[PDB]
Structure formats: C-alpha cells, structure tokens
DNA sequence: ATCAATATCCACCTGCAGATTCTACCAAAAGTGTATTTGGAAACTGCTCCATCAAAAGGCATGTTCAGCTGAATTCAGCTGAACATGCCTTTTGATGGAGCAGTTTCCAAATACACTTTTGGTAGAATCTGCAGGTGGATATTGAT
DNA sequence: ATCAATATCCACCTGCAGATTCTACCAAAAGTGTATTTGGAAACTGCTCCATCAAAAGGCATGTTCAGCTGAATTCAGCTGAACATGCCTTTTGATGGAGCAGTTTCCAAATACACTTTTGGTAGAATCTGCAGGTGGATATTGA
C-alpha cells in the first residue's frame, strides 16, 4: 500500500534460493568474452571447445562461492554482516594466495 | 582351449580387472605388476562408487527424483563426512552447495 | 577410423542396480562418476608407485595398493575399502 | 573480427552480488564488486595461461576441456564432469 | 624497583624469537609426547634421533606458522589478543576444519 | 604428555608467531591442535614403518609423511 | 650406499661464491631442494607425455614442465640455462 | 664424461638414470637428462648466490640453514616455488605489525 | 623531548671445540662401439567442431529514489593477562652397556614378463523408451504494518 | 494479536530432450608354454637406540599487583537494500563454410640392450678453521618524575 519487505529479508530469500540451486550464476557470453580477451592476451588465434569454456566458468563460479564463504567468515568474525574487500584479502592470505 | 572365466568374475567383481592391471603397466607406476594387485584396486573402487551411488541415490529419493544427477551426487559428498574428506579439494560441475546460513544472519 | 574411447560408465551402472535398483543415473552425473573413479585410481596407483619405489621394490602388489589405500582414505571408509580388496584377493587366489 | 577489452566488467553487479548469495553474504559493501573482479581476473589469467601452455605443448590451436582440467589439477583446484 | 609497561618485554620477546632459529620447546618432554601419540597406532617402536627432531621441527613450523595468521585474525578482529577463535578461524579458512 | 608442552613454550612460539598479548585459553587451544598435528603425521609415518616391515620410525618416514600431508621438509634426506 | 647432490652443490657453490662455505645442515637443505625440483619436474614431464599419448620424456616436455612450475622470470632464465646447455652439448 | 660435453657441474648422468628409474616414461630423450640438469644448477647457483650474500650480510662466511630462510622468503620468486617448504632450523624473516608497536 | 636510574643491547676482541675441509683408495656407475628395435615426425585426408551470422523475444542489467538499520566513532570500567621476584624438580648431559635390528646376502620356488593365438566383453550407433522440466493453480506459510 | 500483501508449496499435467535398450564389430582380455626375476626365509652383524646412573642449572610453576585491553552501551551519518521504470544484450534457433583435429600409412633418427673398461663419487681417517659463548665498556631505550 505499498508494500515493501525489510532490508535483509529479499537478501535471505535469494540466499536460500541460490543455495539450493546449481545453476551458473554468472551469465554466458559475457564470461566467454572475458576467457578469449585474457587467452588471446598471452597467445593469439586460439580456439576453445564449447565444453572448455564451460569447464572453466564451473571451475570460477566454484571458486568464488566458496571464497565468499570464507569472506563472510571474515565479516562474521570482525562482528559484522556486510562483508569488505577488507575480508577478501584476509580470507586470500589465510588461503596462501 | 575351455570355458575362460573373467579375472573379475574369478574375483567376485563388477569392475574390470582386467582393465584396471591395463591401466596400471601403461600408467608407469612400476615395472612389474603383482596379479593381485589389479584385482585389490578394482575392489577398492568398486566400493567407493558403491558408497558414493548409496548416498547420492538416497539424495535423489528425498527429493521425488529417480534419476540420479550432479546435484545429488554433491549433497551425498558434502554430507557424508568422510568423502567430504576424501573429495574435500574436489569441485563437481552442476553440484551447487550445501544450503546453509550462518545463524547471526538470521532476523531476530 | 576407429575413435573409440573406454569409459567406466557400464561399471558404475551395474552397481548403481545393485544398490538402487529402481533409479537411473543422468549422463552428467556419470560423467561426474567417471571423473571420481579415474581420480580415486590415479591417487591410489600414485602412492602405490612411490611406496613401491621408497623400498627399491620394483612392483607393486596386493600389498603396496593395500597401503596406498590406508594412507590415503579416512577411517571407516578405509576399513570396509581394506576388507573390500582382500575379499577379492583371496577369492581370486582361491583360484575361485 | 573485433577488438575484445574490458570483458571483466561483463561481470556485472548482480551477477557477483548472486554469487555471494549462494556463498551464503547477507550484505555487501559498495567496494567489494571491484576487489571481486580484480581476484577473478587473476584466477582466470592463472587457469587459461596453463591451459594454454598444455595447448602449445601439443602443438594444438584449440583449447580442450582436457587442457582446463588438467590446468586446475595442477592449481590443486580438480574438477569433475569434464575429464570425458 | 623497576618494571616494564606490559607489552614492552613481550615485543622484545617478539623480536628476540624471531632472530633466532633454535627449537621452542623442551625435547624430552617433546620426545615422550610423539612415543605415546605413536604408541597408539603400533607397538615398541624406536625413534632415529633424526626422526624426532623431523617431527620437532616440523611441528613447530606448523604452530608458528599458524600463529602467524592466527594473530592477522584477532587484528582483523580489531583485537590484539589472540584467542581460541582466530585459532579457530584460521584452520577452518586452511580447510583444516 | 600433551600437556607436556608447556605454557612457556607456547608463549615462545607464538613470539616467533609475532603474537603480542595471549588470551588464557589458547594455551589449551594450542595443545589440541598441537596433537591432532601429531596423529596425523605419525599415523602416516608409521604406516610406512609398518609397510617396510620395521620396528623403527626413520627420519626418511616422518619426511615422506609430511611430504603427502602437504608439510614438505626440507633437511632430512628429502 | 648413499649418494647425494651434495658434491657437486659445493662444485656450483664455488663459482658463485669462491670464497664461501657451507655447513653440513645447510648441504642437507640443498639436497632436499634439488629433489623435490627434481620431482615435480621430473613428474610433469612424465604426465604431459601421457596426456599427449608420448612414452618418452624429452627436453620438449622438461621445458614445457619448467615453465609450468617454476615462477615467471625464474622460469625464463632456467627455460634458457637448459636451452644452452643442450646446445653445446649436442653441438661437440 | 656428458656433463663436461654440456658444460655443467651437475651429474648430467646421474640425473638420467634416476629418470628411467623412477618410472617417468618408457623412454629417455638424450637431452633431457642434460636439460634437466641445466636446470636444476641454475636454480641451486640462484639460492647459494643469494644465501652467499645473505651471510656475508651477517659478518659470516658459512653459510647456515638460516641464511637459506632469509634468502629464500625474501625472494618473491623463490618464495612462491617453495612457499609449501619448510627449512628446518631456518626460523621465521623478522617481522611485527603495525598495530603491535607502542605508542 | 627534560632529569635520572634501570636494564637492555651493540661492539670489539678472545680463545677452543667441533664441525670442516682435505687425504688416500675401491666398487658401481658412466662411457663407449655394436646390433636391432620402434617411437612418433611427415604426408595427406576424412570430417568433427568451431567461429560466424541473422533474427525475434524478453529475461535481466542499469539507474535512481528512499530511508532502514548497519558500521564506526566514543566513552567506560570490570577484570584478564603481563611483568616479576621466588623456589624447586625435571630436562639436559653423557659416557657405557647390551641388544634389538636395520641391512647384507644367499640362495631358490613362486611369481611375472614375453609371445603368438584365439575368443568375447565394450563401445559406437541405431531404436525404442520415459523422467520431469516448465506450466497452472490453488492452499499454505511467511512478513510486517498496526 | 490480528489481517493484507506476497512469496512458497506441491500435486497435477504431457511429450521432449535425453536415457537405456538392442545390434554389430573388433580391440583387448584370456589362453598355454617358456625364460628370467623377485624378494622373501635363515643367518648373521655391526651400529644406532633404549635404559642407567646422577647429578647441576636451569627453566617451569606460583602468587602478586596493576596497566591496559576488551566488550558493552549509545549515537548517528549515510551506505547499501528493496522496488520500480526502461529497454539493451543475452538467449535460443538453425544452418554454413573450413580450420584443424584424429586417423591411416610410410621411414628414419634416435633409444634400448649388451658387452667391455675408463672414471668417479663415497667411504673412513686425518688435518684445521669458523664462531659460539663470554668479557667489557659504552651508548640506548624505557619508565619514573
Ligand atoms: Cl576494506
Ligand atoms: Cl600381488
Ligand atoms: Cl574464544
Ligand atoms: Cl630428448
Ligand atoms: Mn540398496
Ligand atoms: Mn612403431
Ligand atoms: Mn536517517
Ligand atoms: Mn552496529
Ligand atoms: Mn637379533
Ligand atoms: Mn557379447
Ligand atoms: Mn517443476
Ligand atoms: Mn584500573
Ligand atoms: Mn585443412
Ligand atoms: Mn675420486
Ligand atoms: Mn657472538
């Protein structure tokens, strides 16, 4: 009237949503882009199989999940909710990266 | 020459014994190759995929499906204690993660 | 021009009928499965190759697999693997 | 074809923001979208440069999903569904 | 009568430890400690003199090391007191937990 | 035993470690993960005294252990 | 009975260092590090002849190998001081 | 002798036959020993020049497993070929955060 | 910083002890010159796969407005962990004895690698088969203004 | 302690994309007979490893007395959700042209496999330095004032 949820709330929903699924939640050609400005940045007229750059955008969404993981740990330790590039470079360092 | 029972028959298995002391000579893991050795292995991983499609078809019974698929097989991993150990530096394609929130986070 | 590649696809199904009888296993999630058993082999073979090696042995036998896999895997799952292997050892020495 | 540049700002807010998500982060900060970025960039530059050394060693022009898994073998960051 | 603020001997302490290379804790009761926690998984087993030090020195790699980033976290924390939960903190982020 | 490594010795430690003021319960904290580091090493160790069929646990043993449990050793054969 | 690396480090240590000397503890150091570089080495080459269906390591792989382990401009020099050493090996 | 033929100090020899049996490969290409071994000197001058420099910085001419430690961590390079390494009796590179100086 | 009284710490020798560096000689490689053996680099070529492209829909990325409630700045005080002077029992030394026990070695019977021949268990595709994905529709269960 | 606006739930549908069931051919297990090879069973055997004896001299365990820090309260400025409007850029479809794998055959350049004969690296045993561990003496860094 109008209705509106509280901060937080819509935050929950969509952490609970993404959890239980297992789909990429980076978009597709935008990430495939990416993959061939960087491979082409260190050798030059490259193919890449389908499947290659799907390998790969598995393996980086795999990755930072779990880095934002550790990073919540971080903000949770720090006695915090909202997480900082601060945690970030906590989680990495304790990581050996 | 007679009948000719499998290797893996002669051992009880499901796994190809034979396969397996293949793959092992060709892998260069050793010079030589102990007989038991194929067969030992081929037992081993027989039943850790016997384990793993245990739990991971009991993931797919608590969620209405009959059809096992990467999902499941990571709720069955990151549930069961020990193959989380065992597959702890392992990431499975089309798994996503365990659902699970930190309780500060929940609302008062 | 043959091609032909092995897989151990056909292996994982006939147990996964053995366990769960009534389900059926999606392409991907075999893919998955086959990753894992090459994986398991390849950590397996390795330390069994470098145990073998650490004692100027130059094979590997039931024994050296035995270890790898006691090293390698955690507790029970160990226990049941060690039994698993040395059940199928004797049967097949049993010439059985 | 066309010049490819600043491809990483293809990872976009709601993108990463999802990806905290599934990570299980409640809330975050307006600095973090970039310092994501930054990190992602050198995951991706660390994976393809040793896909890539897989490729020129035999003697190939296509990057295969081989190549990528053996390249997070190697970063101790193994994955399965591809290896076939 | 002269004293020291407190704080002041424990960074000369600091300093002075990390100088210097040699072993931090007693052997003996080092060396009675690693023939019990061993005695657990076979028995009457005897030790190289080398094979203790090994385990030593491994081992208090591993305390330093882990105190290292133990103390990152308690900074992190905003603290200067290291305790059971950046301990804590830092071997989950490892993934030794 | 364990609790043979003394409150000192762990102060000591964690100087190298850089850490300026201790809370009272690292101290036990320390000790735990102390052993659990321990088990796991000498577990792997004496499973290859046990393999080479010995009564004796060898430098070669402990390195070769903390060679597969990520602890690489640098001083003492390998 | 048990031989070591440890002779000829010395050898190298003289021509950087002629003057130096090395202790029995650090000679140890030495030996260790020269095997695991070994190893990992020696291990990479021997998976990417298996990946690309080879059987047999050649300075090819322990290059390819090199590059793939050691850090960016430590990899060059070595990628070269191993190029070299071929070289004149092959040539006389 | 090979090694001499390659103009290293290094056992071109003994590197090759530890290559055929440490079960690598069927076979062994003929530089692969003498590469190998290139490359195992240089990295081993690169530390000992660096270690060398690190005890003459002490007033020293032995050097010590210590003198390894700090030449090796501070050393971004070597730092991060070997930061799964530990040197025993090496000790930790001197350092305190900020935060923890008084005042 | 001042003025002073602790302790601390930095330096320039000093002098043995104990690792080290330098000798003196022997098996186990490392080299050689033959004698095949063969791995995998060319020389095309069949033919999957990938890089392009056009096209219409609409699922999401972008910006902006608003303000809830979070992070960071402050003030505070109970009380926890540091700095110490104290007192003692247990870890560090250290020759010596005695003997378990790694190695060494020596055979030899069981266990393997070879080789040349068959003989099927697999795998690449046709063919048939069916979970469930994506659509609806209530009916519940959860939030949040009051 | 309601009620109204959403969001979540989960039972029913229905053929499509994606299984799983045959079907056909070999690549590769399984078959016998040889020609080494492995690496255990007895014997020993020097050599590291416990166990002793037994003290000395530290360190380690204790009990005080605060200096400081950590954690609890309070505020509030404004960063960062939730919602909304606009419309762009990714998606999803359906071929197409070769770019470049994967395959099939030829042929050395190069590797393994013996046999025979230099050399070298590794032992023990002399044969000596590099520094540790300690003294003085002298500025320093601290904490009271
Ligand atoms: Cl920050
Ligand atoms: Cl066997
Ligand atoms: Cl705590
Ligand atoms: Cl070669
Ligand atoms: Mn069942
Ligand atoms: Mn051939
Ligand atoms: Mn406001
Ligand atoms: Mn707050
Ligand atoms: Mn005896
Ligand atoms: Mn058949
Ligand atoms: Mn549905
Ligand atoms: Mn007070
Ligand atoms: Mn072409
Ligand atoms: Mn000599
Ligand atoms: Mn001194």
Redesign the pocket.
Known sequence: ???????????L?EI??YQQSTELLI????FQRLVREIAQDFKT?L??????VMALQEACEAYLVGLFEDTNLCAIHAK???IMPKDIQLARRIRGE | ??K?????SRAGLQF????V??LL?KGNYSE?????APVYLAAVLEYLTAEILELAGNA?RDN????IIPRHLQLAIRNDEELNKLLGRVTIAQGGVLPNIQAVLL?K | ???????Y???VYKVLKQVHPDT?????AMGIMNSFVNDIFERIAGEASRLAHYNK???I?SREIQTAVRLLLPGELAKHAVSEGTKAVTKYTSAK | ?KVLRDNIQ?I????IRRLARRGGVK?????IYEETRGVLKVFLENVIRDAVTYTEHA????VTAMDVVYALKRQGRTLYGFGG
């Open positions: 009237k109008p209705h509106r949820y509280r901060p937080g709330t819509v935050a929903r609970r949503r978009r597709k050609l935008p007229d193919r890449f199989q389908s499947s290659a915090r909710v909202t | 020459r007679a000719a029972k499998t290797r893996s190809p014994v034979g396969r002391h293949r000579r030589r190759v102990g007989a038991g797919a209405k499906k009959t059809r609302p | 021009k043959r091609s032909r590649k092995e897989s696809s056909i292996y059926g296993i999606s392409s991907k042995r130059s094979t036998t | 074809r293809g976009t807010k709601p993108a809330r975050i900060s307006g600095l003697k190939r022009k296509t």
